[PDB]
Design a protein around this ligand. Structure first.
Ligand code: SAH
Ligand code: SAH
Ligand code: ZN
Ligand code: ZN
Lengths: 333, 303, 153
């Protein structure tokens, strides 16, 4: 539905705060900041020699946190492209995430170690707690306002901490239905409201409302707002995301390189988008204020927009025949 | 009511002037004409800054950049040309319009260009590569004026076929089509400063301010004379809220914005006052007349 | 399949089945965007359903407004007038060799004029049917068909 030839080795992308720019990582380890309106590249940053697998914009949009595969995280000013700060860790980093309401702070999910929240002003770090002490794979994310931290382990356990004190404000373990746990693949939140989603190893996305987890307390049984899956193919989900408003949810079937689109309230599947059967789906993102969806597959990015009835359909356009309502004086002088 | 008095008279274009525009900083005045020449002048003293040539045919429109650093020139050579105002260098020459290009405008973020041509199709252009990104069979007649909204989400277009069409920028979607019960040839169109209204001139001695959210004409302005040429209209805001325009009677008409009543008539031009420009900061109005005058006059009022 | 079910399917798929583009026949016209099988519903000429006696009063009205008449005779009693309110079917050119044909259907008591496909129409093809305009005294035709009557009338 529209691709870009000007970028190669697309690996990970991230919309800015207003959905005007897109920073995509490349295998060479370069940042390609490409613009939507001019439909061209806005910037090229020599980030790492190692490909970049995690990228996040700052709220003001002037900072981008990038993670190399060399366990090298670095902050870059979008105007200049300089490495503002640079750090390295053990247990290679799985993800970075700016704090949405404090760009000085940034959480980092490493591979084998617990996620740690650092600051840029001071090169300090706060290691977030781990429930089972043996997960070795815990994804973590700020909420919409950056007030709480949601951490999900490979054993389905879900901890909600407060971002400042790291104190356990809520907890619950998700189930595979019967009695078993499932590897929490990812935690996503809505940029609007409080609904969030969890991708798990059961290939079943679970949509909740964080207020219900907060009122559920520690070690409770919160039910999901929704349960979403491909009941037909039972396909895993490499990457999923909400819509900009938060009423549409998309999942990327890397198994068959497709895109499933459900709703939030009803949860019925909006639609499906099919990509090149030969392409391996890698990354998925939604335009924050547009029905536009960016996909990264086999190093190539594709764009999926959604237009209205007009752009040619605007006499007064009607859809179905209209019986004329004759009047009393319809034949009168 | 304004008391605009003539302060500086500017001239030098060997042919009919087609557009004069104040720089957004109010530092310069760019004047385009059919003589394939553009003229930058001092905006406060009438000091002729320089002449920028390079276009192959007559110039029908020119538009400033928001940072007062670039100028797009739409010429009758079917080409646009983006110039650095400081060096006068032809940074870009935009090819692709199949006929005479009549109007041109930058996006509010100055990184994009809209262009109307005689080909009756509106082209949407990159700035940093100068590449045409979109092209729309907008009207059934040569386009007269195109302009951006306050942010660059909407593009308004006018043409001789009398249609005023609002189009989506991201998609080219023809959002709205404003009709006034007839087919009056619309020679100019532009958004309101608040992006809430639209000023459109029709070639029947009539100006019309429409509500965008309502899609209906809110105010009308007459008393001037405009029936053949692309006479520009501007919002006087640095002092009182007025509507300033040229007229085919050698006058510079100034109506009250709200009451729609003529608040001043600047006389001194000998030909049709073909182009108008309002200073962004000061109560200064540049009025350029046609070839029987070939003069640009600065007017300064106290309110 | 039921004419109501077929009609619902047609009204669901019409917006994405056909388009309007610049036409070598004349100006702008209806082109096929997805291969259309023979006899299947191509498009409704949707519009204002009126009685026949009110046609002239409308026509003269448009004659007073300089607006072209977009009317198709449903039958001796009804007409779909699409001049002021219609759909994309107002951009179907005519060809002496049509791959389409107009038929009136009755859904729940109301008549609908649906252009169906005379043959298997493929993507990109411009959609044309037989207007069957009576012989006047002359509109030249540029349909391009070898059997072209040189005139609709
Ligand atoms: N096959 C044909 N031969 C000659 N004229 C044709 C034609 N098909 C259509 N036309 C002309 O095209 C007109 C269609 S009304 C549509 C007007 C114009 N094509 C537009 O898109 O805006 C008719 O009035 C008729 O005069
Ligand atoms: N063979 C033909 N010769 C002349 N006009 C034709 C024609 N076939 C279709 N038309 C045009 O079709 C119109 C009636 S229905 C309009 C459909 C037309 N394709 C359009 O784009 O508007 C008439 O006004 C006439 O101009
Ligand atoms: Zn024919
Ligand atoms: Zn024929």
């Amino acid at each position: 539905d529209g691709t870009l030839d000007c970028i190669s080795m697309a690996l990970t992308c991230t919309f800015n705060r207003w959905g005007t720019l897109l920073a995509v990582g490349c295998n060479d380890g370069r940042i390609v900041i490409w613009d939507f309106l001019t439909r061209g590249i806005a910037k090229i940053i020599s980030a790492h020699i190692h490909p970049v697998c995690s990228l996040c914009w700052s709220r003001d949009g002037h900072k981008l946190v990038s993670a190399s595969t060399d366990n090298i995280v670095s902050q870059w000013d979008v105007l200049s492209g300089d490495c503002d700060q640079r750090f390295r860790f053990p247990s290679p980093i799985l993800k970075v995430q700016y704090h949405p309401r404090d760009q000085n702070k940034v959480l980092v999910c490493p591979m084998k170690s617990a996620p740690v929240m650092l600051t840029l002003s001071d090169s300090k770090h706060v290691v977030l707690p781990v429930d089972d002490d043996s997960d070795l794979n815990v994804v973590a994310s700020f909420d919409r306002r950056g007030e709480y931290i949601y951490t999900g382990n490979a054993k389905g356990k879900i901890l909600v901490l407060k971002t400042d004190s790291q104190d356990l404000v809520a907890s619950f373990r998700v189930t595979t239905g019967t009695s078993n746990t499932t590897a929490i693949k990812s935690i996503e939140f809505a940029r609007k409201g409080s609904c969030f989603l969890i991708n798990t190893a059961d290939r079943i996305i679970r949509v909740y409302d964080g207020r219900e987890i907060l009122t559920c307390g520690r070690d409770g049984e919160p039910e999901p707002m929704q349960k979403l899956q491909d009941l037909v193919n039972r396909t895993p989900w490499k990457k999923c995301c909400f819509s900009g408003d938060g009423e549409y949810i998309v999942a990327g079937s890397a198994r068959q390189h497709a895109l499933y689109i459900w709703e939030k309230s009803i949860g019925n599947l909006v639609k499906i988008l099919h990509g090149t059967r030969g392409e391996l789906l890698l990354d998925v993102a939604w335009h924050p204020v547009r029905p536009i969806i960016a996909s990264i597959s086999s190093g190539v990015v594709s764009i999926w927009a959604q237009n209205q009835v007009e752009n040619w359909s605007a006499f007064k356009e009607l859809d179905e025949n209209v019986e004329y309502e004759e009047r009393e004086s319809e034949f009168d002088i | 009511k304004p008391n605009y008095a003539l302060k500086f008279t500017l001239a030098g274009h060997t042919k009919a002037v087609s557009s004069v525009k104040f720089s957004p900083n109010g530092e310069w005045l760019a004047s385009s004409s059919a003589d394939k020449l553009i003229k930058i002048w001092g905006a406060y003293d009438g000091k002729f800054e320089k002449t920028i040539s390079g276009h192959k045919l007559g110039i029908s429109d020119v538009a400033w950049s928001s940072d007062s650093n670039l100028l797009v020139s739409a010429s009758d050579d079917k080409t646009l040309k983006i110039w650095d105002v400081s060096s006068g260098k032809c940074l870009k020459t935009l090819k692709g319009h199949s006929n005479y290009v009549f109007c041109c405008n930058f996006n509010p973020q100055s990184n994009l260009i809209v262009s109307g041509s005689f080909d009756e199709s509106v082209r949407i252009w990159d700035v940093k590569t100068g590449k045409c990104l979109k092209t729309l069979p907008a009207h059934s007649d040569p386009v007269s004026a195109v302009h951006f909204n306050r942010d660059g989400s909407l593009i308004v277009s006018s043409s001789y076929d009398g249609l005023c069409r609002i189009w989506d920028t991201a998609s080219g979607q023809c959002l709205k089509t404003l009709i006034d019960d007839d087919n009056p040839p619309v020679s100019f169109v532009k958004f309101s400063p608040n992006g809430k209204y639209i000023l459109a001139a029709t070639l029947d001695n009539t100006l019309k301010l429409w509500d965008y959210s309502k899609g209906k004409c809110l105010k009308t302005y007459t008393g001037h004379k405009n029936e053949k040429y692309c006479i520009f209209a501007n919002f006087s805001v640095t002092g009182g809220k007025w509507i300033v325009s040229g007229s085919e009677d050698n006058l510079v008409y100034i109506w009250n914005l709200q009451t729609k009543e003529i608040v001043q008539k600047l006389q001194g031009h000998t030909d049709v006052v073909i182009s108008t420009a309002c200073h962004p900061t000061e109560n200064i109005i540049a009025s350029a007349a046609l070839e029987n005058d070939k003069t640009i006059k600065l007017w300064k009022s106290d309110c | 399949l039921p004419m109501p079910m077929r009609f619902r399917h047609l009204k669901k798929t019409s917006k994405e089945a056909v388009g309007v583009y610049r036409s070598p026949i004349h100006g702008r016209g209806l082109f096929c965007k997805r291969n259309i099988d023979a006899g299947e519903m191509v498009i409704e000429y949707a519009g204002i359903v009126i009685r026949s006696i009110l046609t002239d009063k409308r026509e003269k009205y448009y004659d007073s407004k300089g607006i072209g008449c977009y009317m198709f005779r449903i039958d001796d009693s009804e007409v779909v007038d699409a001049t002021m309110h219609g759909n994309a079917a107002r951009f179907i050119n005519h060809s002496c060799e049509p791959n389409c044909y107009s038929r009136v259907i009755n859904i729940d008591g109301q008549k609908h004029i649906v252009i169906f496909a005379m043959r298997k129409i493929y993507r990109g093809e411009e959609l044309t049917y037989d207007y069957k305009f009576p012989i006047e005294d002359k509109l030249p035709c540029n349909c391009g068909a070898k059997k072209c009557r040189k005139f609709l009338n």
